[PDB]
């Protein structure tokens, strides 16, 4: 089954670099509007499953509007860690990885002195709003994005799929066991277009995560969620800006979660954005309608936090 979207512009090459032990393939993609201008970068942090093209979507919307988007596939996706590595990360290698590229991309929009900004989706969402409270460069990125970051589940998929609770509780005695519990493909989007690709994807079938990774990405939300001792109060960065973008239908990650994060957080510019009849993967398997509404939302709040 075909990959639903139609790209408008040049998809950049699948680049590769050795890391920590692990070979990351990555992408740059260029501002591609006739206008030598950019506005800004975005780096985007996948989530669980996920990789590359999932993210051609956005990176091709972004590039036409005056966006540069890096995305690289993390230890344990995409091509960086096929077979047996597959699922095989923590939560060390996530964020010790993440600053490798957060530290690649700073340096670079520097030298164009454009500002960066970080993105996050599910998995993502939950390691990009932790980076803004725990990142080395944390005072360095220009402004937060999350897209239904993985805060808390919510009840249905906790129902459904008790395996996603059970095994964080015994990575401590197993760390290296994968696992794989399946695409929710209803619960992800409302297209059915983009279902079937994704159902027939050789890149997202299967999707092992294993002890470690699924309860360091599980704790890593909870930690936000439970706000121990005003923990976002006292770290999030200072006076940076933040929005979260959630589907409203979103019955994988609970929209109460991103609620209450915004809630909690002591920035002066931060927003939570929900948007009815939209599921989970707003930004790259919904329907035309939503993802259009979805990154319009997107492109006016990088132009209001970018100059010309």
Not at 202 to 220: A, C, E, K, T
Request: glycine content about 10%; charged content about 25%.
């Amino acid at each position: 089954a075909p990959y639903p979207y139609k790209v408008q512009t040049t998809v950049p090459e699948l680049q590769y670099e050795n890391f920590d032990g692990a070979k990351f393939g990555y992408m740059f993609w260029p501002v591609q509007n006739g206008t030598n201008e950019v506005r800004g970068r975005v780096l985007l942090i996948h989530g669980f499953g996920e990789y590359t093209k999932i993210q051609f979507r956005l990176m091709d919307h972004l590039s036409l509007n005056g966006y540069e988007s890096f995305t690289f596939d993390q230890r344990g996706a995409g091509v960086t860690s096929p077979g047996r590595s597959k699922g095989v990360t923590d939560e060390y290698h996530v964020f010790n990885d993440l600053e490798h590229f957060v530290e690649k991309n700073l340096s670079e929009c520097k030298a164009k002195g454009i500002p960066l900004f970080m993105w996050g989706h599910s998995m993502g969402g939950g390691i990009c709003l932790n980076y803004a409270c725990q990142g080395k460069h944390k005072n360095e990125i220009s402004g937060y994005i999350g897209s239904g970051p993985l805060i808390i589940l919510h009840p249905h998929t906790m129902y459904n799929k008790p395996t996603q609770i059970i095994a964080p509780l015994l990575a401590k005695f197993s760390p290296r066991v994968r696992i794989d519990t399946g695409l929710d493909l209803k619960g992800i989007t409302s297209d059915k277009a983009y279902r079937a690709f994704l159902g027939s994807d050789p890149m997202s079938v299967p999707l092992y995560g294993s002890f470690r990774q699924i309860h360091d990405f599980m704790q890593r939300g909870a930690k936000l969620y439970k706000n121990e001792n005003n923990y976002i109060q006292k770290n999030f960065a200072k006076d940076k800006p933040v929005i979260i973008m959630h589907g409203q239908d979103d019955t994988i990650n609970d929209p109460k979660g991103s609620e209450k994060f915004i809630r909690d957080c002591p920035s002066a510019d931060k927003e939570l954005k929900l948007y009815p009849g939209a599921r989970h993967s707003i930004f790259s398997l919904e329907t035309d309608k939503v993802f259009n509404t979805v990154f319009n939302d997107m492109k006016q709040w990088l132009d209001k936090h970018t100059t010309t």
